[PDB]
């Protein structure tokens, strides 16, 4: 979680309130990063993540 937070802050300029991680059955990790109220998840996803 510390590395995930540091990477999100350093690269994509995302501030996160918290991070919850699990390991999927296939072997990959899934991370739910809950962001600060100041930023908007929809705006960040549309701009930096390219997700509609």
């Amino acid at each position: 979680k510390a590395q995930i937070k540091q990477a999100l802050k350093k690269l994509y300029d995302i501030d996160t309130v918290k991070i919850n991680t699990l390991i999927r059955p296939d072997g990959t990790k899934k991370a739910f990063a809950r962001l600060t109220p100041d930023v908007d998840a929809l705006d960040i996803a549309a701009t930096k993540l390219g997700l509609v």
């Binding site: 690269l11 994509y12 930096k48 993540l49 390219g50 997700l51």
Partner: protein, 121 residues
């Protein structure tokens, strides 16, 4: 989006590091925007991964060349820069030690060596 080995060889350390950082940032951006509409962007990402490998290889080779120049005239060298050969080949006697001969044998060969001769028919 392909880098050239000759250009990387010509460039020095700082430019190689800057190029590697640029390639890695581009790789992250293209992956995030590739997860949707992975296409010719997949092609670009494949070429960019190969480029990152090329830059890393060039940096490592230049650093090893500098280290070899540093250890050119030193008695001990790192195992990485030491020759590999095989275990038995590394444990064999050196050429000088294997060709070393006793002084009495050296005198005998100096004064009574194998002579050239022919015998008629």
């Amino acid at each position: 989006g392909k880098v050239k080995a000759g250009q990387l060889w010509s460039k020095n350390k700082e430019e190689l590091t800057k190029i590697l950082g640029e390639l890695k940032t581009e790789l992250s951006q293209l992956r995030i925007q590739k997860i949707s509409s992975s296409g010719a962007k997949l092609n670009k990402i494949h070429d960019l991964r190969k480029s990152i490998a090329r830059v890393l290889t060039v940096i490592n080779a230049k650093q090893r060349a500098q280290l070899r120049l540093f250890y050119k005239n030193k008695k001990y060298l790192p195992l990485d820069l030491r020759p590999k050969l095989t275990r038995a080949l590394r444990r064999r006697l050196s050429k000088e030690d294997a060709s070393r001969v006793l002084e009495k044998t050296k005198k005998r060969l100096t004064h009574f060596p194998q002579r050239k001769y022919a015998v008629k028919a």
